[PDB]
Subunit: 341 residues, 4 copies
Amino acid sequence: MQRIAINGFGRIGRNVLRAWFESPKQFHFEIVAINDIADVHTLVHLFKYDSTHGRFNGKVDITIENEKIYLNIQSNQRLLKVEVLQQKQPELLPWASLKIDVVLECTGLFRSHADATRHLEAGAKRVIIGAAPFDHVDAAIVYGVNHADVKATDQIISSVSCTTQALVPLVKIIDDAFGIETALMTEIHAVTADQSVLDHAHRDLRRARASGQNIIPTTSSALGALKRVMPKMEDRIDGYSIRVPTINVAAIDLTFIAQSPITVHHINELLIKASQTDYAEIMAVTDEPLVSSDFNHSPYSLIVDLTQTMVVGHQAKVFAWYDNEWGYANRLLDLCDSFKS
Amino acid sequence: MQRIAINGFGRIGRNVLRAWFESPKQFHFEIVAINDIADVHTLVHLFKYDSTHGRFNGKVDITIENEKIYLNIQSNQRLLKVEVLQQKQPELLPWASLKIDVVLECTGLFRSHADATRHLEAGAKRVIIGAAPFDHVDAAIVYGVNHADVKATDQIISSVSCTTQALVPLVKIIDDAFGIETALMTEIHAVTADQSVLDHAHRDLRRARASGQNIIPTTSSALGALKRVMPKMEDRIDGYSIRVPTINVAAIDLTFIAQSPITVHHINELLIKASQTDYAEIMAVTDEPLVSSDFNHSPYSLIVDLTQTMVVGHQAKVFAWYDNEWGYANRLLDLCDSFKS
Amino acid sequence: MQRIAINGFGRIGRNVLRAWFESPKQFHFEIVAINDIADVHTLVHLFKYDSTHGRFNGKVDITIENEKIYLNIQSNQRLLKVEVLQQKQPELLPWASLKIDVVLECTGLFRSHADATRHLEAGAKRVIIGAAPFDHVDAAIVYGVNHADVKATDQIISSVSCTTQALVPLVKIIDDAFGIETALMTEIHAVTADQSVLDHAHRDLRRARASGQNIIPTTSSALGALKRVMPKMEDRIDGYSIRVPTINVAAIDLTFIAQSPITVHHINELLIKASQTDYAEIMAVTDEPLVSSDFNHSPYSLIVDLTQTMVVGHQAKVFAWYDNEWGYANRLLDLCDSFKS
Amino acid sequence: MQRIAINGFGRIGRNVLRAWFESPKQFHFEIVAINDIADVHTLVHLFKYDSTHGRFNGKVDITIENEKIYLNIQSNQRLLKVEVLQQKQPELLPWASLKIDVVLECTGLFRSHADATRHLEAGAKRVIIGAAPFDHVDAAIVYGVNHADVKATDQIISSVSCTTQALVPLVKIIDDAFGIETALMTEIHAVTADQSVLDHAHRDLRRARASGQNIIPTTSSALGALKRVMPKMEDRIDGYSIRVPTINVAAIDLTFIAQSPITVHHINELLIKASQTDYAEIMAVTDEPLVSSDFNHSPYSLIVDLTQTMVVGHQAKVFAWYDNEWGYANRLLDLCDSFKS
Ligand SMILES: NC(=O)c1ccc[n+]([C@@H]2O[C@H](COP(=O)([O-])OP(=O)(O)OC[C@H]3O[C@@H](n4cnc5c(N)ncnc54)[C@H](O)[C@@H]3O)[C@@H](O)[C@H]2O)c1
Ligand SMILES: NC(=O)c1ccc[n+]([C@@H]2O[C@H](COP(=O)([O-])OP(=O)(O)OC[C@H]3O[C@@H](n4cnc5c(N)ncnc54)[C@H](O)[C@@H]3O)[C@@H](O)[C@H]2O)c1
Ligand SMILES: NC(=O)c1ccc[n+]([C@@H]2O[C@H](COP(=O)([O-])OP(=O)(O)OC[C@H]3O[C@@H](n4cnc5c(N)ncnc54)[C@H](O)[C@@H]3O)[C@@H](O)[C@H]2O)c1
Ligand SMILES: NC(=O)c1ccc[n+]([C@@H]2O[C@H](COP(=O)([O-])OP(=O)(O)OC[C@H]3O[C@@H](n4cnc5c(N)ncnc54)[C@H](O)[C@@H]3O)[C@@H](O)[C@H]2O)c1
């Protein structure tokens, strides 16, 4: 079967591996290697114990065989033997000897076409950048929207961002049915790994500020990314993100001008229908009075909160939740599974 | 020289009293009484020691006469003697004896014209409900917008909500310059006194949930209230509020459809000129990369973050911060000071 | 079976019901009624969605049959039909007709022997007060330490507190092995339901204070409680609790003077042996560097953290974790199960 | 007079410069230079805007005179002109040219005697290491305890840690009056800048875990530092630190065995008397029902909470609060002032 490697064993990388074991349906590929600059004992500890998603429900054993380090991981009636590497320079990875079909690049540091190619140079056949593109990519994929357009020549694929995987379906479903003149996105997002505990020097002066204390407005990569998947939306959408002191789960607030008559009732019926048919793999809709923690560990790319839909004149707002870690992780698995042979 | 009383000595009431002392402008009226169901010792302790605004910078003496109880408060070279009451039923209050010109109704429990009138029965001349009207009021006021529309005959007045006091200026300023077809508000708000520590039974199933752990979408009274202050915008505005785990300070995100040509530059230029002329009392504008904490203890009704301004087609989004406790409290005092002859 | 009822469907009562459903081994008694002052739609909503313990992994359907309200709950191959009451006065509850064998008193309001006897008046055969004794009880019980002391004639039983169910085993084990001259406890505890979101009037001026913003030292009922369970330890142990901004899980820091030679090694070995033999049902020991969230949803009364153990001379500190909600709730069900068996 | 420089403009460096402006006492020395790896704009931003201590009540102007960058700072009727540097390696700094009497080494990185001497190599006469010693120092000083013991020839001084400056007075006073056989310390501490936002690789597997979600036991440097100030206490004292989700302020809980008769009353009288005489510069005592936020921006090294004092037999516990940032910063300024003699 396909052989996947993970580069960067962080929030995303770890959750990717966890989600593999937890999936109700076994995936027709294996994760055979991981790479991080941190040492193996640190990685196994963080893999096993998570403040957000709880204890890994399984067993992990470190072995040294030849001069190589492996994890033997057993859970949910599955076992993976996974080689562990510690190489800060992607070009030096052994992807050639490990026969790596797909690298998931989850470090945040190799988003450029050139940087991503280092894995190719190392002998991997395909990279998925687990982030919005920086400059160029062969393809920008949202699973469940355009994963069928991947061609065998697409070697550098971006799986965009949590935010994009939620925004893109909403925009598409709604634009397809009612037509969107323009739209503006407000995201309300849990804290991220790159924020600060206390006020501290940082590249961004807002993300420098104490994350547990502040409401922090910041930029979002999701708009640039959406425009690469839907170029027709150029100059028709913008937005930003707001970090707030929760550990996980985010929401998108999308405000649009419709090109045809809208009611709350019709918007919701459209989204329900979308969720039951074409987008059932990735989208749910709820009518219950729920809050962020209710969607922690949810595998959906988005869960529309139909109770928040509002219309005034031609202007509407819709609202969807997502687990920004578990949704994304599951979509990386789904995406890999879609490559088939 | 008017005589103000405060009913409900909570986040708003205490802050009103503090703001009187801390104001660089000395007000003409005196605060001469306060009432709460809690005893004076609890009241003075919470007045002195505040988790949000810090230690009160002054001296509080409690005096027990045969009958009456008084605080003697000294700070910033000002002195008040303040009778303290403990009467749950506002009709039984001795406002007649005390010659109360204005009661500030800060309990959250007496917003109906009926309930507000309990203070008129107890002997007060005028009541300012410190919230959105529940049904009828002689006037709904946003200081710095329609405070002159108060008639010397008006007895039951509403100072609406913090949210309203920020929404209305924005909507007014933008409607007057560009025209607003429709607008939709997203408020991102610190937790409030009525929320829950842990998941607990509550009249509102969203506010029942742990306030420190969750992003919580909920209703805003601001929209109902804005209709009263500006009935020309009936059915043109809607919105909601999101609670997040910060202790204080909020932001409004207003997305509108303009009726004439707009750019980021033009919108900002207008908001700047407004803050420098007609609205300099209640409004500021910044371009510095700030976050919620930086507005704690700010007395402004709103501070526009101009770097957040966005335009797509006929649609735009503006963003303003406000201290939901300190701005409102200052606006109550400003309102009381407007009644002066 | 035996027939249990829960009085007060809060953090404890709701977790008791959940724990009934989640226990790997099925309990051989049924929960047949719950009572609370909140309406049934609020109860069912909070039972299904939990900020701390996640979604209930099952289905709940409300039915009206006669004039009676029922919950039909399905989870883990198990079914209960549970009558819902809403009676603020326990003497008025229909325990006679429901043939209640045990009431779990989980409101915090009926801890006195008199208050608790009201359930007996209503026709229940036995009450467990899910709190420290207020004045008198027939028995004060720590499951796993002295639950075999319950007499057939005992009708008002205290299951003490979470803190007590952790402290008592620790003291008993160390005292039996090395002897305790004296000991002092510091508990670090997540926020509880009776605290405040913002600074607010309260009967206790420390629990008045914003629970998300502060370290708040307060009293504990566990020292009084331990005295009832182990009278020899009168005048030998004291302590207190600190509330900190986490949502669940606590720790005991116990400092004791030993009456015989001690080392870190010998203390940890003892605690381990105890957890593997006599205390296996309620006690675990870990050697890994774990934090509070790693014990969320743990059913143990205590998990000793052997990395924390310190000795200087004759003085020693031990440290144990517990899920204050889930442990206690499991112990309630274990206690009920003990009467049957 | 005397010329100070700050190496590292973080929580400590920044608060030292703020504390300089805010001190009621005007200090007989000037801060004439700061160095950080971050650019001047970030530094000035973080000096002006603080999530913990609020906005600097003053003005800062950046000028470029020659090719040198300077901050013109004005606050509290006082002025400084501070050169800004951006050198990653201390030996390169221009201390000789600038005529630096004392460098405050606040990076956390140059705590070895060797790394510290790099500043003396750079032309500084004296370094204070603003942290516990790594290997050797000429003197480990707790201001208000042993600062008289600095020799004019001492060149590499440690001002220990925040925790050390609260613990040492407590230990000394109690040991002096009553004799301490042994003692154990539990510190309850706000989060610190080296902690994690989310679960992230870290040298310390505990400090790896999400800082806003968890109670986190970890090591304290204070025991090693205290044994350098009081070698007699070797083998007689140990302890640790628990990090909890607050932004600032900590407490020490000291459990000790007394060598002579003790009561609560006598321990409290002692600590009170100490605070009023020989420790009046650094120590206070309160019996008010206060919480962490009430000691934010307190300049004391420790504030004893006398209500927390417990005695059982020969064992006692005391409790003291401190602002871990603002206390230490003031003690740094106080130590520099002591060198004028
Ligand atoms: N977390 C989310 O909600 C979310 C959602 C969508 C996309 N993303 C993206 O995922 C990426 C990673 O974010 P995260 O939250 O997992 O962050 P993280 O900081 O938890 O992960 C970074 C990891 O990479 C490792 N690493 C750093 N440099 C390395 C190198 N040179 N070689 C190998 N390993 C290296 C680090 O040790 C760490 O384990 C970012 O690009 C982020 O935008 C995150
Ligand atoms: N907090 C904000 O940011 C904000 C801003 C604008 C308006 N408001 C409004 O201000 C009002 C009060 O809100 P708050 O945040 O001060 O709440 P709070 O809970 O802090 O204040 C309520 C106070 O009223 C007292 N009280 C209760 N019953 C009483 C009675 N029968 N008689 C007298 N006092 C009684 C309570 O003891 C308490 O001190 C509400 O209408 C709220 O919507 C709040
Ligand atoms: N939560 C813990 O960590 C913990 C652990 C051990 C013991 N306890 C004890 O258990 C008790 C309950 O605390 P909790 O955390 O579940 O609190 P909670 O506030 O979550 O639960 C109280 C519940 O009782 C209901 N109630 C109120 N009045 C009632 C009445 N007259 N009749 C029936 N129901 C009524 C409330 O509506 C609410 O559902 C307290 O005595 C507490 O000290 C709590
Ligand atoms: N904050 C506290 O509560 C406290 C109290 C006592 C002691 N300390 C100790 O003080 C030290 C620093 O702590 P902090 O909280 O101020 O940390 P911080 O991380 O907030 O500040 C460190 C600063 O040093 C700068 N820096 C890094 N490398 C540098 C270099 N080579 N040259 C110049 N600047 C450099 C960083 O950019 C940053 O501004 C640590 O040893 C800490 O343990 C902290």
